Amino acid sequence: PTIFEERHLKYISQLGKGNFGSVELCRYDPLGDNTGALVAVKQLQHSGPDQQRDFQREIQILKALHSDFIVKYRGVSYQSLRLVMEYLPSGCLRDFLQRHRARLDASRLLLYSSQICKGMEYLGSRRCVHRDLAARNILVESEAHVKIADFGLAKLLPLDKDYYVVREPGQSPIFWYAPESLSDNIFSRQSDVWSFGVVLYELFTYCDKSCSPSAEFLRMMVPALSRLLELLEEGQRLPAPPACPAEVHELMKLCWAPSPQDRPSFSALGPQLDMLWS
């Protein structure tokens, strides 16, 4: 049922590529008449023991998450393990905003914000920290529906602790990380809230490259990690997006509070986003 036969997974193309893994577009087609469903299939390529263990955790995490705003686990395929997910043909939200900017207004962006928030609220209820919340990792289900994706760096909190310390820092872009993550490798639901603030910045700049998080931080900026951390600890933040409502920018600034304790929860952000302009 949730076991997918290798021989019926017809490869079409690559969707994304990583250093130790890749995501491929396939049609699972048992009948062989091209009528079967399209699926996104993740697999490791020449990985080490550490990456295989993480991949086993990722599979079980995603398998247990049930939300309308999180990409759906479909099953597995077995020498080498493969993770089968639903396929969302509209692609990631970053490319979508850039491509369809003229068609999408501020109310649509707030709809996406609300749905991402609800997904993250649900993730926090499962004691799960995403660690890589960004517009590139949000998928478009339809023009009025987005889902959080890419659980490769996701980790569950310890049962009796609200934070997690990463030993070996995974090389993802520094401009979505909270201060404590950069300084001390501390991750939590509150560090995800920081990243959500950057997602709101991404949405309301329509993921424009010229004014991206990196581009704008680099303008404000001896090492790059040490300079970014120095800048944030002085209180310097990303600017208001030009086409952003005042109240939305105020919520971004609360998401970026220096102390994790002073940042609002996704449960407190949700109603604030939904009640805007009513």
Ligand SMILES: CCNC(=O)c1ccc(Nc2cc(-c3c(F)cccc3Cl)nc3c2C(=O)N=C3)nc1
């Ligand atoms: C014609 C151009 N087509 C696309 O540009 C396209 C279409 C669909 C697409 N979908 C993705 C993409 C990813 C993905 C990745 F491949 C690398 C890094 C991060 C993510 Cl979220 N993951 C999943 C999916 C999916 O449907 N289910 C899981 N991605 C790209």
